[PDB]
Assembly symmetry: D2
Homo-oligomer: 207 residues x 4
């Protein structure tokens, strides 16, 4: 049974880059909904699995097929937002300070500088044509190389792709403050990105 995680900061702590009113809605409404949806979907599948064991019909298999969409969507919603809060921090807790160590080294070697990586990421965020996410990732299958990937809806990066920084591009993540001006939001959010958490994820090679 999953639960809304504790936040490391107060709702209004990322102002002026992200408003407290957005954070409160985003966390108490949107994230809680994925929490509830995920627990419900997992419950429903456990129930369908028990039904399939006694009556392994295509009819019942068809029912399982129907709920896995909810497992994926709500599971992703749960996961992506958890990652999101943990890679945000107020300036007082180091938000917006550049990474150090191995991650900083890989960033410079692959993209030239942190500024270029961020510009690439903002291009990707702007390129999400619908709801979705951009993730700075470490790819474990090609020697641990950095990349920036987009996902849609609540799809997430799995397998060898370890998320280092997740940035939410759903309209609910910025609309009350930025309205249509999503590029202003993408630029502003880096001021409160927690690159210490990114570095920790990079070093661990897991989340």
């Amino acid at each position: 049974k999953v639960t809304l995680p504790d936040l490391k900061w107060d709702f209004g702590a990322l102002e002026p880059y992200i408003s407290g009113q957005i954070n409160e809605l985003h966390y108490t409404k949107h994230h809680q909904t994925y929490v509830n949806g995920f627990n419900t979907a997992v419950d429903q599948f456990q129930e369908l699995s028990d039904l399939l064991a006694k009556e392994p019909s295509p009819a019942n298999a068809r029912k399982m097929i129907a709920i896995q969409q909810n497992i994926k969507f709500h599971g992703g919603g749960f996961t992506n937002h958890c990652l999101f809060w943990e890679n945000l921090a107020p300036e007082s807790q180091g938000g917006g300070e550049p990474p150090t160590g191995a991650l900083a080294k890989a960033i410079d070697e692959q993209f030239g500088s942190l500024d270029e990586l961020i510009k690439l990421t903002n291009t990707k965020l702007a390129g999400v044509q619908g709801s979705g996410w951009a993730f700075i990732v470490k790819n474990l299958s090609n020697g641990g190389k950095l990349d920036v990937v987009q996902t849609y809806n609540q799809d997430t990066v799995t397998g060898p792709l370890v998320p280092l920084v997740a940035i939410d591009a759903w309209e609910h993540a910025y609309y009350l403050q930025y309205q249509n001006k999503k590029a202003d939001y993408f630029k502003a959010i880096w001021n409160v990105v927690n690159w210490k958490e990114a570095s920790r994820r990079f070093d661990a090679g897991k989340i």
Copy 2:
């Protein structure tokens, strides 16, 4: 735990429209693969579910998300092929005979004729740009109306959509016999379509 279903006919019973060499591989290899994949996926779900209970972390959620794909794909593969075998039959069991009853009436009212419905379906089949299926369906949400829908890969029709006739458009369904000539396969298969089974599905809405 699912298994391959009983067939109502022998592998060679659909000759010459669908070769026995195809049916044998199709059932004993391809369908068996979805059976095994689905059973594995459901087992793995059960294991991840216990893991999630012990540690409900994003990491473990991530693992669960990863296997949903296989549940969907192999579950669809299992379900779609079960449908397929049940709506195929040799002529000796009524394959290729036109439907009667309420289904026949609905077909004529909506499409003009069975011939016109079949042509529409062959157009949908030819329009699958990849691996996939066409389904003639009854839509329970809009008053029980017939439609033809395409799916890709092992996606299937769910919700208010009741499959009446499933036709496999994956290349493995025809390649040994027809190779690139998929339209020849789409045309030939209607000689062994079991419309009695479609009519039963239509009447039951299940």
Copy 3:
């Protein structure tokens, strides 16, 4: 070269159901974005088509493929919003009044009532897990039957699926006013749906 269509109503005309603030942003910003993107994409096609003619390489084919996403997305955004404004109207223009004629008959015959069709549509709207649309459509390929279709992002209904009512489920369509309570928005919008335009679309079959 496309442009924003003229609106038949002032930005604040759909209050209280849809905020004038939302309509103004939705039209002057969001719809404009799609107009700009589509014009840009069609210009690029034109340039790449000429390039491909002179040099029909896989390299240039690859470039042509790369712009198709923009054509589809912005083309969809352009088209869907045009449909949307045309099927909305203030109560003073007859918004929210039930359809009549053939459409009204088809709705009663297939769904039982207008309320049942609306209920089904709201279910499809709530079912969009991401950004998207629901369309009440008339299907030209199954004898002209009504159905409700979900799309994601700016995907739209084409070919035999004729849109009668388009409803936007992107968060920018409701968030300033309803925030997370999208179900409240889906319920409210029917008060300003232009069923007269829906009936016109149904009769024209385009």
Copy 4:
């Protein structure tokens, strides 16, 4: 107007890894079909594009949206198969011989060995749940790092993702010889992969 490309080898030249029967059908039927489809779709779009100039209506935009699906699919079909033939060669023409130069250096640095890259690719190919492709690519956006990407149907890798080796995982690519044993096909094809063409693409950073 695109045309079927010239092949560098005879239909039967890749036996016994891929039969002459397959190559003949694959090239003269399947590839040709995408050639014809792509030419048709581009002509149709040009036609609608000219109409849209005079009638810039939602109706006409809707018609163009329908056609872009065919441009993408047949365009991809044309492109992927052109890449495919160019990265296959008989053993007499160097097929199956390991890459050298910068490409070989990047492979060992990122994957450990060619064999590890090949195994990863075979895992990706087996993971295509439907029709599709695997590509070994050079990613120009992350400092030119190698990766392996899956696509479905005739989707392809565009922009910063430069295809180095394309491997076809559609059933028509192997069924007549391998039937359901696709893993055997994925394993065998490397014996006739042209790594010299892969190296040229890697060096040029384009196709």
